[PDB]
Symmetry: C2
Subunit: 119 residues, 2 copies
């Protein structure tokens, strides 16, 4: 079943990391959790809180990499959009990572992730 | 004393737009408002909702461009870091803007803003 952009939806990226969207309130404010599974990365396998916004098919979400088990001294923010291609829902995003203690915008890391529907 | 990343701190960028940080809770989760004053832009002069995170000197914040007076059908996300120059606090950021209904990450707009302390 094609998954739409809703509360209680999960999405897995090319690293195997999952965004678990928990609530989307009447204003479109988002809560959820993120589990990182990128091979060799720190802060894997434990849930990090997420907040953000949904506006139709546009979405932003952000996670601070500090939880009860591990810190990675940074914050990731994703901007992107929902699309249905090949009969499956996905969230295509660009992201920025800012590290605590930075002194230059050149230190902000940039990339892109695509998150496919998952159960 | 230079303003730090605290609850009830305000920051104005090069276009005259202001981030009004309301709360920063014990986990560093942020709430606030944003007023856009960029010349020639839509969604000026009214408050938009903000959420995000603070981690030491790292900060992310994001606003959905919908309120009770005007929609701009999009979401902006800023990623940045705090610096203290000459006793002025400021936040150096890179931002991404995603529009509802987008179909390619090439449609996400990007720029650079520095938000400096204001009273």
């Amino acid at each position: 079943m094609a998954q739409e952009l809703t509360a209680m939806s999960a999405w897995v990226n090319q690293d195997g990391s999952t965004l678990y969207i928990n609530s989307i309130n009447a204003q479109g404010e988002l809560t959820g959790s993120y589990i990182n599974r990128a091979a060799g990365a720190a802060c894997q396998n434990s849930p990090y809180p997420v907040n953000g916004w949904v506006f139709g098919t546009a979405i932003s979400f952000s996670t601070k990499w500090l939880n009860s088990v591990e810190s990675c001294n940074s914050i990731t923010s994703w901007s992107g959009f929902y699309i249905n291609t090949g009969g499956q829902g996905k969230i295509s995003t660009l992201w920025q990572l800012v590290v605590n203690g930075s002194s230059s915008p050149s230190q902000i890391l940039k990339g892109q992730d695509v998150f496919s529907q998952t159960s």
